[PDB]
User: What shape does this take?
Amino acid sequence: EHASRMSAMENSTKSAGEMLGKLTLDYNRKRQATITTELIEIIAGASALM
Amino acid sequence: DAGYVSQVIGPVVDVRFDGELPSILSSLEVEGHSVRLVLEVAQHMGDNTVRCIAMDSTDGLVRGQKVVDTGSPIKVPVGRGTLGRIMNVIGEPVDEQGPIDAADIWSIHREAPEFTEQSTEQEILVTGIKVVDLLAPYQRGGKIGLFGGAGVGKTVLIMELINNVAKAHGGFSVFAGVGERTREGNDLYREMIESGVIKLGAERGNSKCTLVYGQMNEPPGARARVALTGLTVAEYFRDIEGQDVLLFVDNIFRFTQANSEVSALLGRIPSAVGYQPTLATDLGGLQERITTTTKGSITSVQAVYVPADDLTDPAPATTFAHLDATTVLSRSIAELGIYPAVDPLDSTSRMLNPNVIGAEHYNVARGVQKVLQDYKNLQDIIAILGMDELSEEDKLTVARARKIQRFLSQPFQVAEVFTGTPGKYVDLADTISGFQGVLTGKYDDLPEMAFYMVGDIKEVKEKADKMAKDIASRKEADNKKVSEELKDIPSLDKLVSEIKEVVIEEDDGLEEDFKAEALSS
Amino acid sequence: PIERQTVAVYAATKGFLDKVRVQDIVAAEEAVISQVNPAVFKILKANGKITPALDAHLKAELRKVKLPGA
Amino acid sequence: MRYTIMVSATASDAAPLQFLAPYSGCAMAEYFRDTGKHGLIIYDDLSKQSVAYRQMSLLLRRPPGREAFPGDVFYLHSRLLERAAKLSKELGGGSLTAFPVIETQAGDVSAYIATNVISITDGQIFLETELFYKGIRPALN
Ligand SMILES: Nc1ncnc2c1ncn2[C@@H]1O[C@H](COP(=O)(O)OP(=O)(O)O)[C@@H](O)[C@H]1O
Ligand SMILES: [Mg+2]
Assistant: This one.
């Protein structure tokens, strides 16, 4: 039992590393997108006054 | 001699003055308007034109309407003659009790006191709320912030701080309602007639509170200046009458939101996430006046709304550097049923130094926070696995923290209609004695829900002894009570026949009402 | 109506609707609103409270009811 | 206080006065560096200086960049912080040690002023709030 939990908890750290890698790619895409979004909001408010 | 309206765009009015423009921050009056419309000069636009924010609605303003300079800023009545009254942003009474008697009328704009007349004295303000006076204790004379998103309990906590601190103390109180619901401003008004804080009629001089109200329906020019109006009433009580004041401000967030609503119409290119470029210095000009000086003392309690439970947002994040005690309320504490939903870790006070509150209050507070922090580092592994590998050192600190978590909950005397419980005032010594019991294992045998919504540790023992009476009192009513009674559970149409059948009118009859409203007036 | 809501919430919070399959609680209370007395709703609507002369009188009338499966 | 100067541009002061206070505190501290002695300058909330400088720049209608900050907000803090040096022996050998203080929000060191000052400075003393409630005080990550 201990030697199949060891092979089960190895297969779930991979699955929690593959999921963490897809989330970090998804987070960096959202991080880049909210910096572009807040900046377009700032330039639009500035171009409406200038 | 006077100016005229040149431009009306929303709440922002441009007034053109032929000769001798009014000063910035000065008050202007539009005559000919349907109501009293007060403008306040925000800037000089540069062609003999000032740009103003309106303290009321600009519906019905006309370009060319005569504007009278008053020669000073907005002046409101201050003194004992405002105790027991509700004021406007511009000092008008909105409680329909006549004109406001005024010792003096004061400009709502002044500078911060000085660096030389600051007070370096720390003494604890005991509130009765045991999560407050244990972990983040308030200072008598300092600025207190109540943070939290929508619906976590900022207004109930600020209501419980009114009747636990202001109901019996030496000086006066000022409630500044800044841009919140009108319904709860009426709830606060009627609660203070019944509590005797506000007395009406000829007993009005024995009042201990002044309400200044600028609630959500008011335009952004109004809600941006109510906090200055209520602070001016508190600054008269501190500077002139030299006495201790309590100043409660519900949502100081709405002061920053109101300035942000007019800001782009004042010609300012916007700052980060949507606020005005002058966000930190508009807020800083307000909070620097709410201080204990060498003349008197203003104990401020400010609710701060955090938008979408985000303490990262610039309007809550700027407020954090202005306070001496930041009670942070959390949704996750509220969703479990612990009320007041105070985050016990995120709440920080400056009275939590050992050379201020002593060592037997500091070590209990740092001990309670250590057990609650450890439990949150184990709750990552309990919610996955389920606390059968947790060492019985870690199992004991889960049971100790879960008792500590419920023992920070307390029934409030003002939440007696949400929770069906009479409220509990807990003294400071009984809070220190109780949590030192739960920390050192003096009460490890008591159940977990015996700590929930009680006063002190003597009422945990009066509740654990109660629940262990009343769970073994379950089986008296199982084998009987279905039948064979003294017939005060009587027959069917016996209970149907005392029903006083109310007459239904079976048509609305409003067109007879609508013609009747025509003949009246 | 509000009187048939509180009777159905009474039938679930006073333990009269366990021993009932969780798939047909939707059909269980359709019996419970229809098989209890149509006069017990009128008393609860007129009083607005479930009185002590009624909370036993309804929970003993929530036993003379036929539920699916049971 | 017999060794300390305090330059205080508080919250009610004008945003030009909070922008210039780290620079005027540095010039007071550069006296000891330039005359062979040693200095310790602490810019407590250098992130509050940049907010005061962003206020002046948006009001002067200078074109805003990320989080509405100016273009020269890196040049703001680098020109200040590069004045903390150890001087050579032919200039007295004096020194100035800077401790800028940057407040993050939710521990985000990818924020725009935080990445600027991390670039300028040599090290960082990261204080994490999760270690602060574990009893580890000073809560140094
Ligand atoms: N101490 C408390 N005890 C019981 N219920 C509470 C307490 N604090 C808040 N609540 C519940 O939370 C709801 C919202 O609280 P409220 O005072 O409106 O907070 P906010 O002003 O932040 O929205 C209240 O109507 C009440 O039901
Ligand atoms: Mg509220």
Summary: Chains C and D do not touch (no CB pair under 8 Å).
